[model samples]
Target: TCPFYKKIPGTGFTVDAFQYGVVEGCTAYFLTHFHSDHYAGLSKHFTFPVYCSEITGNLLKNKLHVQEQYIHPLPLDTECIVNGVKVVLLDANHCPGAVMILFYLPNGTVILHTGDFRADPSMERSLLADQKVHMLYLDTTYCSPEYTFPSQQEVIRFAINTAFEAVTLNPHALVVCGTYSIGKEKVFLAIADVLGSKVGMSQEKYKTLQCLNIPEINSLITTDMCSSLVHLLPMMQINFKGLQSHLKKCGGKYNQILAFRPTGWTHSNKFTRIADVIPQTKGNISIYGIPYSEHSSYLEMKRFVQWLKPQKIIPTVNVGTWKSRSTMEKYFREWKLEAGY
Candidate 1:
C-alpha cells in the first residue's frame, strides 16, 4: 500500500516518505538526509514524528520551518527503539549529517537502507565487520560501468590544485566554482583553506554554510562579490549566461575567469581521471569538470554488495517497481563483468 517510500511489510515504519504521498496508517518515519530530492513533499504542515540526525533536524526546523516537536534527532551509531523496532544511524558519507538507517527487526532479520552514501573502507572495517545484513536498499545512482570516478579526497585535491593553477596562470582571472547547496562543502573549504582566501556566495548560501558550524568555513564568506578571488556559486549559476552577466559587472577588472565544476559527469568520457585537468573554453571563460562524486560507482557498489552479501537487494532510485527490478538484475549481472568483480 506504500507509494513513495519502502515499507517493511508488516511494520508501520516508513523511510523517507513524502508528506503528501505517505501511505495511510503509517506510524513513524526516518529521514536519511536534508537533500531536496529526499525531502520532497515535506513542509511545515508535516505532522508525524520524523527521525534524523541532529543537523538534519535543525535544518527541518530552521530552513523548512517544520515544527520542532515533530523532529527527533538521532546520534550516530546509537541504537534506539521505535515502536518496538531497533534502529541505528550510521554515517552516510555522502553529505554533511547524512546517515544510513539500520533496522533490526524483531523476527531476527536485519535490514539496511543506505539513503545516499559512498563506501568508506574504514566504515566496513569498523561498524560492519561481522554483522549479518538480510535485506539491503542501495543507492544505485551510478550503477553503470561507464562511471569510474576517483576517490573523493583525490578529487578534492585535484580541484584545489586546478583552481590555484588557473589563478596563477591568469593573474587577473578569478576562480569560480560551481557546487550544490550542501553536498560539495568539502571542495569549497579545501580550496579556501589552501588558497588562504575567503569564498563569496549569495546570502542564502552563506546562511546554509553557517548551519554546518565548521569554523574553517565559517569565516570564509565574503559578501563583496567582486572582492573575493575565489567564489563558490551554486551549480545552477555557473552556466555561460550567468557567468557572462557576472563578467559584465566586473567591468573588465579581470581579463579571464576560470570555473570548476566537481561532479561525476566529468567521468562521462571514462578517459579522464581526478589528476587530469581538461578545460573547455568559451570566450573569456574556461570551465573544467572534476570527478568528485558523493554516490557509489558501479565498482564501489559491487564491492559493497560483496562485502555485505545481503540475502536480497533493492534499489532506492526512481526505478522501484518489479519491472525495474528485472531490468536492474540483468544490468547488475552485466555490469559485474565489466566491474571486475
Candidate 2:
C-alpha cells in the first residue's frame, strides 16, 4: 500500500472512510469495525486492501461476503509496517471487533483515530499511554456537556433490575431486548445469563453471533420460537407497533410483553437516575427506553482529552453542528491551561 506510491497530506491513508470508494491518492485502506456507517461504501467487488481486527475482518467476509484476498487481519497491540507507516491497533471498547488505530507517519507525526468508543479508565494502560499524540481523531458522539449519562455497568444493573421486576409481576411476560446487529450485546446477554434464560433471535442474526463466539454467549440463543420467552430483536422491531406484530406472530404464548430499547438519549437531563424515567405502556405491552450507551459521556470525553492532551483534537462524529468544532476548541484550551503547560 506505499513508500514510492506517494506521501500526500490528508490523502494517503484512510481509516473508517470507505464511503467514497477509493480516494485518488489513497494507498492503504483501514476499517475500524463492521458498523453500518463505517462500512457503508464497501462492497464484495471492492478492490482496495482493507486492514482490521481478525474478528472484524471475518465478519466482513461472512456478513458482506467480501473477498478474502482483500481482507488483512491484524493482531491487537502489535505494530505492523503498512506501506512505510508504523500502524498499531488498540481495542476501541465500542463493539466486539472495533479498534482505535494509531498511525505513525514517516514525518514523525502520530495520529490516533478512535472509531466510536466508550471512554474507559483502562485505556490509560495501553501501550501508547499519553505518548505525545500530535492528532487525536476522537469519536465525539456525545461531545456536549448536556449529553451526560451513567456508566455502562450502572445501566446494565438498571436493565437487570427492570427486567426482574417486570417478570415477577407477570410470570408469562415475554422480555425483548432491542439491539443492533453487533452492538448493545451486553444488555441482553447479561439479562439472559442472570436469569438462565434462553434467547430467541432471527436465524441470520444467530448465525452472525456464532461468528463472534462471545464467551458469555456460548450456545445461549435458540432459533426455535417456542424454546424461549426472552428474545433479542432488531432496533426497528421492539417498538409498540412492532411488538404488537411480534406478539401475534408468537401465537399468544405470553400474556404480557416487556421490551427494552436502550440508548444514550434515554437519559434526559430531566431525569435523576435511569429508574426515574417511566416506561411507556399501552395495555399489557410496554417499552422501557433506558440509557445503555457504548460511546463516552461528555465528562468522560473531557477527562480523556485532559489526560491525553493531544496537539489537535479532530472529531469524527456529530460534527455537523454550527459550533461543534469551535466549542471543542475552547474545551481543549481549558485543558491546556489546567495542565499548567
Candidate 3:
C-alpha cells in the first residue's frame, strides 16, 4: 500500500521491498515494474541481482543508470528457474513491461503475484487458465465497490474527443498532457495522432520514450518543447500554476493551456460517461482529470478471483491501517467466498 511492493509470506524472496532496508533473506530482488515506488532503494552503488521483464530492465538501465550485471531481463510467458523456485512472467497489462509473477515453490504452493494489473479479459486465456493458484497476491488499488470506472479504451477515447473539442474551440490552445516517465504514453500518443500533431517534450523524456520500442515513436515525439502545441510533461506540471508558469516560459508560443491529468482516482461508478467529467478552468488554463487508470476495477478483481479461485488472497494495496486493510478484506471475503475459496 505504501510502496508499490510486497513480501511473499514464508519465503525469503521479497517483491518490491527495496526501500524498507534490504529485506532479510531476500535472496533475489524481484521487481514487479520500473515505477519509482517499486524500485525505490535501488541505486548504482547497490550490488544485488534484480529480476524483472526485459522492458522493465531496459527502463531501469536507461533511466536509473543501473548496471547491466545486476539487472536480469526475463522474457514474458516463459518459465525460468530462479533461486530454485520456478518463476514465470505474465503480462500485467498495467504498463509496458509490467508482469504478474507466477511462482512455483518446492512445497507445491502456486503463488500468483500481480504486481499491478488492469485485469483485462484477454488474460483469462493463458497458461494460468489451466492451473489452480494457491495464493493470490492481488493489486487492491481499487478494492472498494464504488471505484468502478470505465475501461482504458473508453478513457482514451474520451481523452481524444476531449482534446479534439478543446483544440477545435481554440486552435491556438497548447495541449499539455500529463504523464509519468512510462505511464499514459498511449493516451498522449492517441491524442497527438488524432489531432495530426506531434508531442513535444524535453530531451530527457525523449530519451526515456526511446526505450519503449514503439515503432511509430520516431515520428510521434519531438525534443523541442515549442515545436508542437501538444506537450508531454510530468503529471505534477499539468496543474494550474505549473501550466501558467510553462505558458509564460514558452514566451507566448501559445496563449491558452488545455491540460489533462489522467488517473482512475478522479472517477466513480456513478458517472460512467465522458461528459460527466467537467473540466476545471481559471483564466486561460483548463485542466481535465479523467479516469485513465492502469489498475483493475472492483468488477474485474472479482472476475479474477472467481477465475483463479486461489485458496488465500493477500491484498497489495490499502493495508496501512487495520481499518483500511479490513475494509478491503471485507470485499475480498465476499469475492473469495464467491470463488468457493
Error of 2 at 327 (Å): 1.9
lDDT of 1 by residue, 4-72 (tens): 436765577788777447577788887899898778888898988898998888788878889988989
Candidate 3's C-alpha lDDT?
A: 0.83
Cα lDDT, all candidates: 0.78, 0.80, 0.83
Off by over 4 Å in 1: 318-324, 331-341
Q: Give the clashing pairs for model 1.
A: none
Per-residue lDDT tens digits of candidate 3, residues 175-203?
98887757768888999998888999888
Better of 1 and 2 by TM-score: 2
lDDT of 2 by residue, 1-341 (tens): 32221122543677776776457778778888888988877879988888899989888888888999999999999989887778899998888889998888788888888888998888989977746788888888787778877778888888888888778877788899888768788888878766668888888888788777487565688888688878988898887899998888888788788898886654364456765767889988999888777888888888888888788777777566668777877777887898854
Worst 10 residues of 2 by lDDT: 1-10
Indicate the residue-level lDDT of 24 in model 3. 67
Span of 10 residues, lowest total lDDT, candidate 3: 1-10
Ranking by lDDT: 3, 2, 1
How far residue 93's Cα lies from its native spot in candidate 1, in Å, is 1.1
Best by lDDT: 3
